[PDB]
Ligand binder design. Structure first.
Ligand SMILES: Cc1cc2nc3c(=O)[nH]c(=O)nc-3n(C[C@H](O)[C@H](O)[C@H](O)COP(=O)(O)OP(=O)(O)OC[C@H]3O[C@@H](n4cnc5c(N)ncnc54)[C@H](O)[C@@H]3O)c2cc1C
Ligand SMILES: COc1ccc(-c2c(-c3ccc(C#N)c(F)c3)nc(N3CCC(N)CC3)n(C)c2=O)cc1F
Lengths: 651, 125
């Protein structure tokens, strides 16, 4: 039961803020009843999850509980209803048992038949509401978008399931997480190196986290600090401490050879002071043996004074020898010449491109403090790919539903009385449509909400607080090249392999190739600053640079001309205006929460009761904890559908 | 605290960011301090290498009984005016008297080789 709580992103042993607000009875009450609640919940979820291919009615739930549980049966019901409302059971595609409410209640216009839309639409329809979706495209699925010619199949948007471990989600495939790199020329990268740098990359990142949290380096010049800025600062400070070592060493060489100097002096000025004595002694020793005692003394005196200074010099002569090997050692323990080579900083640049890829933006742009706020909630499990094309999901969700394709929303009008959406035909701009509804669910991409002169007018205008969050948060970019061939010329044991770019400025450019699919297809990702530029570069040139890269790596004649090519231009695509959200410098994840707060119109006649809210938001860009994924969309949808039903069908 | 083998003082961060090129000022004025200290190293090696020349050859061409003769007693007294209390020197000079026999003599005669008077002379080095 408790790893069905986890499979539902819920704690098995505590009630959540959500549960608290729908069951204040139980959570303010005795600890015993909480356990009963929590059992019935965890169990109902387990039951749904065990067979989610078909509806779990209040009926079946009660039948398959035991013990003192189907004792209290308003509680089993209050719970089962709470779960189905918040889309924890009976969501997605399920064979209904009790067929749909005869006649419907309230009318909702959903803008977009992306996954956030479809998910909300199905829920709202399942609760007996009149739902119509308006989609500008000639298809469903939005940023889920699968190319399909012959047996060729390639996703141009989402292609990964980053974990099934508590993920609300068709043929999935593990990723062999072994990725060989290939410098500009074609030369693989010795595993020796690949590991040096991946470790340096990993350390460089933790370094920025320390630099952020411990050292509190998040502002600098009023302007806040990008992950980029922090990484450069860290790398500079590493370069500096290379030199700080280089110095303190070549400096403890000098200190040592100004001891050899000070001593080679004493040792010269003894050779001399000893030459004298040995003269003076030869001389005194002329005066021959029948001699008086003042001259036997002068002989003997000298002879003493001379075997004294001879020992003293031999003592300084082993000291000479120590100081001389001590030095010959240090002269052959040079510390590291450099922090990283050039070939190194170029492979580091690829590890940074891989980061620019996932986050779909230049690290210039990521919040140092907050880029990774979503990180505690990554799922558990193997990261997978959809072999058969992700399109299967939108399409599957769409059937049942009232979807108007080629219907571009131009204006959204929301008043105390209700809403009208004004849309047009994309195939004649001129032909106009007016949808009147109780409530509008906006799943417009953040790209579109951001369009500098608007694609869509809100009447009245979205409040400061909303538009400010839209301005603040980042909407990135990430493009793909689909390479279709007659024959499997790469290494088929290998899922993905990197290309290392010449410069920093080009680390994004066809930096990584995926083999995912049944057909002979290679995916080439453009990430970072590259993603944005290549959109303004002819299809042919791009497929050029692809084949170039591939011929250098594989042999100039194993690499055919391609049967079919596609190239994403998501920033230029006006129904997306980019790939997905990122927490920009000076944004936080709070903005994801503002993005999801619905809008409540002013009163129609002044001094009339407070209205009902009318304008609701879902989409990738509206879910703090699962931004920039399909699941996050899917959830934002289920969520809004609940918030809307709680209003227009009562809580 | 910083991951192993990264270096980040509160101090150094403030200092490599305090303007828009503190960055590559700091890196260079070390690059430059480095060549200075390499140049000092060559100079002090040349200087040292000369003195090893001056030392060529080294110093190679430059190396008991308890009955006191009168010869021996007079060698002692003189050794005293020129070694004060260095019984090892005095014994080395006299040739054939342990460092004790010196110290003894040093008292036995003391009165009649004016040895106090001898030692206040040796005071004046
Ligand atoms: C290249 C790329 C790769 C990705 N890879 C992955 C990945 O591997 N795994 C993963 O989990 N996530 C991935 N994502 C994220 C995932 O694709 C999105 O988070 C999700 O598909 C978007 O859900 P949504 O319903 O919020 O948006 P959308 O799919 O954008 O839905 C919004 C809909 O509104 C429509 N629309 C826009 N303007 C108008 C208008 N004026 N009138 C009417 N309709 C309009 C659009 O055409 C679209 O159908 C990727 C995204 C991209 C771009
Ligand atoms: C092995 O290959 C993988 C490569 C990338 C991820 C990954 C992705 C992601 C992003 C874009 C694509 C595409 N195309 C993708 F396939 C995956 N997107 C995200 N992000 C989640 C958090 C958000 N802020 C941004 C997207 N993350 C974290 C990822 O780990 C997972 C993998 F298994």
């Amino acid at each position: 039961v408790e790893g069905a709580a986890f499979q539902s992103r819920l704690p098995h042993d505590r009630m959540t803020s959500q549960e608290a607000a729908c069951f204040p009875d139980i959570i303010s009450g005795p600890q015993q009843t909480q356990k009963v609640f929590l059992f019935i919940r965890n169990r109902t979820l387990q039951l749904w999850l065990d067979n989610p291919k078909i509806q779990l009615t209040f009926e079946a739930t009660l039948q398959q509980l035991e013990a003192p549980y189907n004792s209290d049966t308003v509680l089993v019901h209050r719970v089962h209803s709470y779960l189905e409302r918040h889309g924890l059971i009976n969501f997605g595609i399920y064979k209904r048992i009790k067929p749909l409410p005869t006649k419907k209640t309230g009318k909702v216009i959903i803008i977009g038949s992306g996954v956030s839309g479809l998910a909300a639409a199905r829920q709202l329809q399942s609760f007996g509401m009149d739902v119509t979706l308006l989609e500008a495209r000639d298809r469903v699925g939005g940023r889920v978008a699968t190319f399909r010619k012959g047996n060729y199949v390639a996703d141009l948007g989402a292609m990964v399931v980053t974990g099934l471990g508590g993920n609300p989600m068709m043929e999935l495939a593990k990723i062999k997480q072994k990725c060989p790199l290939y410098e500009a020329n074609g030369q693989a990268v010795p595993k020796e190196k690949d590991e040096m740098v991946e470790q340096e990359f990993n350390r460089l990142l933790e370094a920025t986290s320390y630099l952020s949290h411990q050292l509190d380096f998040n502002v600098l010049n009023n302007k806040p600090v990008s992950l980029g800025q922090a990484l450069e600062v860290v790398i500079q400070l590493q370069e500096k401490h290379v030199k700080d070592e280089q110095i303190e060493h070549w400096k403890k060489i000098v200190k040592t050879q100004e001891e050899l100097k000070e001593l080679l002096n004493k040792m010269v000025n003894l050779k001399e002071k000893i030459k004298e004595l040995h003269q003076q002694y030869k001389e005194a020793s002329e005066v021959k043996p029948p001699r008086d005692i003042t001259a036997e003394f002068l002989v003997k005196s000298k002879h003493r004074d001379l075997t004294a200074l001879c020992k003293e010099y031999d003592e300084l002569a082993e000291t000479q020898g120590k100081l001389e090997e001590k030095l010959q050692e240090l002269e052959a323990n040079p510390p590291s010449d450099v922090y990283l080579s050039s070939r190194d900083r170029q492979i580091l640049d690829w590890h940074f491109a891989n980061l620019e890829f996932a986050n779909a933006t230049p690290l210039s742009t990521l919040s140092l403090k907050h880029w990774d706020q979503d990180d505690d909630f990554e799922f558990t499990g193997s990261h997978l790919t959809v072999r058969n094309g992700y399109s299967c999901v939108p399409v599957a969700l769409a059937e049942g539903l009232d979807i108007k394709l080629n219907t571009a929303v131009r204006q959204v009008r929301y008043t105390a009385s209700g809403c009208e959406v004004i849309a047009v035909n994309t195939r004649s701009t001129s032909q106009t449509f007016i949808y009147k509804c109780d409530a509008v669910l906006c799943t417009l991409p953040l790209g579109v909400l951001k369009q500098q002169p608007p694609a869509v007018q809100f009447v009245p205008p979205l409040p400061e607080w909303k538009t400010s969050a839209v301005q603040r948060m980042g909407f990135g970019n990430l493009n793909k090249v689909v390479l279709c061939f007659d024959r499997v010329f790469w290494d088929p044991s290998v899922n993905l392999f990197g290309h290392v770019g010449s410069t920093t400025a080009s680390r994004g450019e066809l930096f990584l190739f995926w083999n995912l699919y049944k057909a002979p297809i290679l995916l080439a990702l453009v990430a970072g600053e590259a993603a944005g530029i290549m959109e303004n570069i002819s299809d042919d040139v791009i497929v050029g640079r692809c084949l170039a890269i591939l011929k250098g790596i594989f042999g100039s004649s194993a690499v055919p001309q391609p049967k079919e090519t596609v190239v994403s231009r998501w920033r230029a695509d006006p129904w997306a205006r980019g790939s997905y959200s990122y927490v920009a410098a000076g944004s936080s994840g709070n903005d994801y929460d503002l993005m999801a707060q619905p809008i409540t119109p002013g009163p129609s006649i002044p001094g009339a009761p407070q209205p009902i809210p009318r304008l609701f938001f879902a989409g990738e860009h509206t879910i703090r904890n699962y931004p920039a994924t399909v699941h996050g969309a899917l959830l934002s949808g289920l969520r809004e559908a609940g918030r809307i039903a709680d209003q227009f069908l009562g809580a | 605290k910083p991951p192993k083998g990264m270096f980040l003082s509160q101090e150094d961060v403030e200092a490599v960011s305090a303007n828009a090129t503190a960055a590559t000022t700091v890196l260079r004025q070390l690059d430059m301090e480095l060549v200075s200290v390499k140049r000092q190293i060559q100079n002090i090696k040349q200087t040292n290498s000369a003195l090893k020349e001056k030392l060529d050859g080294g110093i190679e061409p430059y190396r008991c009984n308890a009955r006191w003769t009168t010869e021996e007693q007079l060698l002692a007294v003189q050794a005293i005016r020129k070694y004060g209390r260095d019984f090892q020197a005095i014994s080395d000079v006299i040739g054939n008297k342990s460092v004790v026999q010196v110290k003894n003599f040093f008292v036995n005669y003391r009165r009649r080789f004016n040895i106090d008077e001898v030692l206040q002379e040796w005071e004046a080095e």
